[PDB]
Amino acid sequence: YERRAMELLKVSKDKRALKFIKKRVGTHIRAKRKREELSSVLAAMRKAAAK
Amino acid sequence: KVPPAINQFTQALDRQTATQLLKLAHKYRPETKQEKKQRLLARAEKKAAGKGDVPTKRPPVLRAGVNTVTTLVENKKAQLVVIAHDVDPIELVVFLPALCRKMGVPYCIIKGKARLGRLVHRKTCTTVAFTQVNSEDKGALAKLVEAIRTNYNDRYDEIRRHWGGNVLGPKSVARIAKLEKAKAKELATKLG
Amino acid sequence: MSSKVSRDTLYEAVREVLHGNQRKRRKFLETVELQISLKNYDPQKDKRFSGTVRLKSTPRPKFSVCVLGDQQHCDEAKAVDIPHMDIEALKKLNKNKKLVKKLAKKYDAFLASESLIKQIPRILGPGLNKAGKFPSLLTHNENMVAKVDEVKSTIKFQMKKVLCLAVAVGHVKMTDDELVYNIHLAVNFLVSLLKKNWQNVRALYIKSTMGKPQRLY
Amino acid sequence: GAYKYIQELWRKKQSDVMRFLLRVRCWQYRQLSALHRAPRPTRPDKARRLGYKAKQGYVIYRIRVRRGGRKRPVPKGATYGKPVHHGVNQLKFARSLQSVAEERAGRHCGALRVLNSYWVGEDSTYKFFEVILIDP
Amino acid sequence: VVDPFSKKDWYDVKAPAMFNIRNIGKTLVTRTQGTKIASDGLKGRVFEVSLADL
RNA sequence: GGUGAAGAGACAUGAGAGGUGUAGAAUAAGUGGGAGGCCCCCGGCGCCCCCCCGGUGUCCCCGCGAGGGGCCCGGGGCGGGGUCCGCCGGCCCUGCGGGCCGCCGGUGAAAUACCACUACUCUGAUCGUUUUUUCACUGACCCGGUGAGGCGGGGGGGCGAG
RNA sequence: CGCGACCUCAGAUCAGACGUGGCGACCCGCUGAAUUUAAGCAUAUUAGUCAGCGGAGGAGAAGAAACUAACCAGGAUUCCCU
């Protein structure tokens, strides 16, 4: 479920990535706080690949 | 197919290299039973002679338990780590090679937990580690250290990328070999 | 040189954007300018600019201001040393019924005042007008006590349907302390008005001229 | 601390060791008993965390339980009474499957007293618990 | 669909050496692409070749 | 609850580029403007690669010479090639010591004798991820039979056959 | 092949220990209906109750807060008044 959301953030439709995380984990608090951790890791991936 | 962190557990050492490792260790094994007691009793008697007690220097020795080994690895006080490859729950030391990669601590995967057990009075020991050794043996250590780290640390990339198993049984190997032989043999069947 | 490629991404730091633009050879003057993409940037329809900025130095392009009048700017013209004229004939800086022949824009900035708001092409005339940009409305200046404002070329951001404007962030010879303030005082409003949906995956590009305009995060 | 690493590992999932070593129990509970002694707590993390010490006198019995609802046992499934007390499909038992397992192992082995239990696998129609037991 | 006569090619024909014509003629068939490799369905075919042309 | 192989699909990455019209002489270069960019051939300086030896202070030879000397410092000079990155000078910042209708004169696309911010995707399509189409794979699952008795490869191999 | 470890896994009239079974007044965990009441009747009520099962003790379960609160704040469990 993390990898799927990471791919959906790769295509960058955050309003669907959030819905995916919510419908699986449950609480909008947790989905909001978890999309941040999925980003800032995808960001690290791209940043260290272009490096 | 075993995962990468499990398939790392199958490129164990070369036998003769392990033999140098063990012959090194057997001058370093800790104190076993009926030795402990005699040394301690003699030390109690040296107390009245002011030349030895329980608190006095012990030359460098082994560090066996997983908790102790991981503690001193994450404090970077380890110069060599050995790992028994066949451990009952693999999750005990699945992480360990990654830790050694993180902190540059040389580490090797030996066959058998029984040998590490024989390295003490106990029956088995998941890992052992040299922190420091007698200087006269430091070079002999360092040569084996280089031989180990050449193969287990610098290629952590391919190790973690590795996959395993997936090897199809000989029955099906022959069964597919029939049709591969047939197609290779009669290829170019049409005038094409 | 026939190079347009900025293959960089390019991340170094948020405020260290002053240490990577300095690719200097041009013994002429290098218009080290600034621009940004068009994807999800509607050239005219639903998205456009109004933001303000102030540079320090006039680059190679002529960044000077003059008449109109539209009072207090008659006095500004007579003080900033340009002949001033109200309506007599639209022959100051036009492109068709002109007086002199310099660069088609003849300058890179002309502000407004508050008698009417479409009188710029009627007083000094076209230029940016002929190029399809409008220097007559939304100038955000009146400058009755500021001439150093125009000789440091107080300027703006403004839409265009071709691609966009392109506004300079300094030169290489002048320090990078200039460029850092200029970028971080110009594109803060650009980040505000273009980072609402477009999340800035690619970068804001610097027209760092002489054959290598690039970008920096 | 090694047990910190082990803890974090068990907390995470999506590694196949569960699939590998769950069959190692599904086969053997059908070769040998569905209730049998293990010689070592497979999760020395969780056993110790619940309270365990490998001092002599401590046992663990790993035991299988069959999962599902609980169909109400009556002949031909039509229960006499007012029609809110019908219903035999969707009924749900009132104790944790972990608790059912614990009591099964306890009642099987007298002279051994329970201390706690924990989860080791869950196939499709089962649950693979294990119980820590003291020899009092 | 795709023109069915696409990948059928004229496999050659031959007689016994005891006759007087060895290159009798030709016959079309498709090659190995699916599960119907050509020679498999090619063996068992039989022609009608007469003395009055051979 | 898994595997492979092929066909239909989306896309993120990804090395390589952009000519021709409706006002004029080129393409008046997705666009920005430079009436002058030098792609700086360039004195050569900022200065890299030999010699020259102040600290003949370093010393492989070494163990004792005797020097080829390898070396590290630091040095009053391009011995010689120079856009090997890049600041002054001189010139048509070299259309004529390459090079490019004049942008501004075509009321235009933002005009392009020039710096050139962008990318229209088609550039090898690697290379990943994913939706589907079928074909097959067996290791969970199930099915039988037996006192779990010659299973799959091979070979000697003997029989004869051609 | 042979030897030797560890691991798994076995039998034993092996050495020493231990459990079942009863009582059930009170306690604990499950299961748990219908008469009856609504003037009829099914939701409800009777009731998480009688019947059923398992398990103990001198008492058992509880118990030191993932608590109450909203105040100028209290502060494990149980029992009585309220």
Rounded CA separation A19/A34 (Å): 12
Chain D residue numbers with beta carbons less than 8 Å from the beta carbon of B91 are 6, 9-10, 17
Q: Tokens at residue B165, please? A: 């198993």
C-alpha atoms less than 13 angstroms from C-alpha of B65 in its C-beta half-sphere: 6
Classify B128 as helix, strand or coil. Answer: strand
Question: With touching defined as 3+ CB pairs under 8 A, do chains A and E touch?
Answer: no
User: 3-state DSSP: chain B helix, strand, coil percent, rounded to 5?
Assistant: 50, 5, 45
Classify D79 as helix, strand or coil. Answer: coil
Rounded CA separation B5/E34 (Å): 41
* Interchain CB distance below 8 Å, E9 and B189: no
Using the structure block, give the residue that is written with the tokens 């047990």. D3
Task: Kindly state the greatest CA–CA separation across chain D.
Answer: 61
* Interchain CB distance below 8 Å, D2 and B66: yes
C164 touches strand F (CB under 7 A): yes
Q: Is the CB of residue D65 less than 8 Å from the CB of residue D101?
A: yes
User: How many angstroms separate the Cα of D122 from the Cα of each of B3, B144, D4, D31, D97?
Assistant: 21, 45, 24, 19, 11
Rounded CA separation B68/B91 (Å): 17
Q: Which residue from C141, C166, C163, C145 is spatially nearest to C154, judged by alpha carbons? A: C141
Task: Kindly state the greatest CA–CA separation across chain A.
Answer: 36
Q: Tokens at residue B189, please? A: 């069947």
* A50, closest residue in chain C (CA to CA): C9
Classify D59 as helix, strand or coil. Answer: strand
Rounded CA separation C15/B113 (Å): 55
Residue B91 touches partner D, C-beta closer than 8 Å: yes
CA distance B187 to chain E (A): 9
Classify C137 as helix, strand or coil. Answer: coil
Chain B residue numbers with beta carbons less than 8 Å from the beta carbon of E30 are 190
Approach to solving: cryo-EM
Contacts of D21 (CB under 8 A, 6+ apart): D42, D121
Q: Is the CB of residue B104 less than 8 Å from the CB of residue B149?
A: no
Q: Is the CB of residue C141 less than 8 Å from the CB of residue C112?
A: yes
Rounded CA separation A38/A4 (Å): 11
* B192, closest residue in chain E (CA to CA): E31
D-contacting chains (≥3 CB pairs under 8 Å): B
Rounded CA separation B156/E44 (Å): 60
Q: Is the CB of residue C152 less than 8 Å from the CB of residue C56?
A: yes
D85: nearest nucleotide, CA–C1' criterion: G33
C64 touches strand F (CB under 7 A): no
Q: What angle do CA C159, C165, C170 make, to 5 degrees?
A: 135
Q: Which residue from D122, D126, D120 is spatially nearest to D43, judged by alpha carbons? A: D120
Q: Give one word for C143, left, alpha or beta, with left for phi > 0 and alpha for psi -120 to 50.
A: left
Pairing of strands D35-38, C214-215: unpaired
Q: Is the CB of residue C79 less than 8 Å from the CB of residue C147?
A: yes
Q: What angle do CA A46, A48, A51 make, to 5 degrees?
A: 110
Residue D27 touches partner B, C-beta closer than 8 Å: no
Select from B3, B67, B91 the Cβ nearest to the Cβ of D9: B91
Q: Is the CB of residue C73 less than 8 Å from the CB of residue C150?
A: no
Rounded CA separation B81/A20 (Å): 44
- Got the DSSP string for B59-95? ------SHHHHHHHHHTT--SEEEEES--SSGGGTSS
Rounded CA separation B93/B81 (Å): 12
Cβ-based neighbour number of residue B113 at 10 Å: 19
* Interchain CB distance below 8 Å, B189 and E30: no
Q: B138 pairs with which residues across the strands?
A: none
Rounded CA separation C161/C176 (Å): 32
* Interchain CB distance below 8 Å, D5 and B3: no
Q: Which residue from C2, C30, C34 is spatially nearest to C216, judged by alpha carbons? A: C34
Pairing of strands C154-156, C33-35: unpaired
Q: Tokens at residue B30, please? A: 């800790």
* Interchain CB distance below 8 Å, E38 and B186: no
Task: Kindly state the greatest CA–CA separation across chain B.
Answer: 103
B124 touches strand G (CB under 7 A): yes
Rounded CA separation B25/B130 (Å): 9
Cβ-based neighbour number of residue C139 at 10 Å: 22
Rounded CA separation C21/C106 (Å): 28
E-contacting chains (≥3 CB pairs under 8 Å): B
Cβ-based neighbour number of residue D68 at 10 Å: 9
D78 touches strand G (CB under 7 A): no
Rounded CA separation E54/E49 (Å): 7
B171: nearest nucleotide, CA–C1' criterion: F152
Rounded CA separation B156/B152 (Å): 7
Name the D residues in 32-51 with CB < 8 Å from any B CB.
Answer: 40, 42-44
Q: How far is residue C216 CA from its own chain's centroid?
A: 20
